[PDB]
Design a protein around this ligand. Structure first.
Ligand SMILES: CC1(C)c2cc(C3CCNCC3)ccc2-n2c1nc(=O)c1c(Br)cccc12
Ligand SMILES: [Zn+2]
Length: 113
């Protein structure tokens, strides 16, 4: 099992849709989640978050064929949104952002596979 091209294209498309998504207001919800903060700017995050992941890492994993399925991919997206729900205050915009991105990923997953 190496990963067929179509799987890899699918994932990229899905994760591309999540990243480029904008709300009605025109805003791109993912922007903050693309890169993990520095251990200098936000050391508490890395005390508080067991397994840190950003959208850059997810793309690394797709490119390097490390997800064996769409469901392995999804498990890293939900970790991302979960890390974001853990660290950020409930009802904060980042917290709410992560929940919509969960949703956007699921929709993308059906419109694409
Ligand atoms: C909102 C917060 C804490 C954050 C702040 C900053 C900056 C802003 C400007 N001043 C310094 C810090 C950067 C990155 C992130 N970030 C955050 N929460 C996440 O959940 C998260 C995830 Br899953 C993946 C990647 C980054 C994340
Ligand atoms: Zn390859």
């Amino acid at each position: 099992s190496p990963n067929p091209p179509k799987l890899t294209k699918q994932m990229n498309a899905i994760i591309d849709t999540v990243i480029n998504y904008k709300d009605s207001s025109g805003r791109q919800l993912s922007e903050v989640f693309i890169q993990l903060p520095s251990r200098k700017e936000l050391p508490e995050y890395y005390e508080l978050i067991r397994k840190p992941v950003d959208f850059k890492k997810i793309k690394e994993r797709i490119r390097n064929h490390k997800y064996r399925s769409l469901g392995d991919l999804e498990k890293d997206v939900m970790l991302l949104c979960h890390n974001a729900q853990t660290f950020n205050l409930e009802g904060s915009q980042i917290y709410e952002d992560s929940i919509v991105l969960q949703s956007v990923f699921k929709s993308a997953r059906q419109k694409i596979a």
